[PDB]
Structure formats: C-alpha cells, structure tokens
C-alpha cells in the first residue's frame, strides 16, 4: 500500500467542463441522480477526452 | 474548474492492498490487461469496499 501519484499530479484532478480539460490534469464527472457516486474518470489523449475506466458488461 | 476534493482527501488516494486501506483512503486499481487504464476505484463504506463509479447498463 502506497500513494498512487505525487500530489503534484493529484492536485490536477479537477471538476469542470469537458471542453476546458487539457492534459496534465484528470477530470471527474460527479453523478447527480446519485449523491456520492461518480460517473467517469477522463483523461485527454489527442484532443479527445477518453475514459480511464474499462467498460464492463454482463 | 475547482479540484474535485481538497488535497488532504486526495493525498489518501493510494494503491495496494484492499484489506489495509482505512475508511479515510480511496483505493485505485490499475488494470493489468491494459497498460494505462483503471478497473475500479473503491472506498470503505461500512467496512466493505464499494465502487465509486456508477454501474452502467443497456
């Protein structure tokens, strides 16, 4: 057990508009219908804002 | 575009044992199949680990 990233790279975990998320920062999309849950973690790669969570099916 | 949470609560995002993380820590799990993905993010609710990301269905 140890920390996952230096706090410098964790201070750039933000909550905002997908259109203003550049690199050197990760995006979190909070859920509305559910209070504490999250919807997706996102990271831009080539202008597109892709997810870091692998899709899981039945 | 504020940080999703403060640093005292982001500092406690860690990587490792699911058994050793307290209620104050968020657990990350790096996907082993893919090289830069995530498979789950967990924090202790009632002594049990539960995914923060909302479950998706079709």
């Amino acid at each position: 057990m140890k920390r996952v990233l230096n706090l410098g790279n964790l201070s750039r975990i933000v909550e905002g508009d997908p259109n203003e998320i550049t690199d050197d920062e990760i995006l979190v999309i909070k859920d509305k219908i559910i209070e504490g849950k999250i919807i997706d973690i996102q990271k831009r790669v080539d202008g597109k804002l892709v997810s870091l969570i692998t899709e899981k099916y039945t | 575009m504020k940080r999703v949470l403060n640093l005292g609560n982001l500092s406690r995002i860690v990587e490792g044992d699911p058994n050793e993380i307290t209620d104050d820590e968020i657990l990350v799990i790096k996907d082993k199949i893919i090289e830069g993905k995530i498979i789950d993010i967990q924090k202790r609710v009632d002594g049990k680990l539960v995914s923060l990301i909302t479950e998706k269905y079709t």
């Binding site: 057990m1 140890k2 920390r3 | 050793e20």
Partner: protein
C-alpha cells in the same frame, strides 16, 4: 525470521523493554551489514508510505 518486519522488531524490543528496562534506557543499537541497513531503510520507507 523468514521476512523482515519493523512490526516484529518493534514488538520484541518493546516487550523486552517493558519487562526489563526503564523508559529512559530503551535506546538500542543494532549491528548489521550494509544490506541490513538497506532492508531497514526499505521497511521504514514502506511504513511512512502508509
């Protein structure tokens, strides 16, 4: 020991110290090779990392 742990070491030394030594005279000094000092360093770092 099979695997080294600051847990195991801290317990043994304290139990010894409680039974045998005053609070003021529990300064211990271990003798090792360079590798034991490294193994110590790694474990100490693993803890503060927790």
């Amino acid at each position: 020991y099979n695997t080294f742990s600051l847990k195991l070491l801290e317990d043994a030394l304290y139990e010894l110290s409680a039974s045998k030594l005053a609070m003021d005279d529990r300064l211990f000094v271990i003798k090792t090779g360079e590798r034991g000092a490294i193994q110590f360093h790694k474990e100490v770092l693993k803890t503060v990392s927790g």
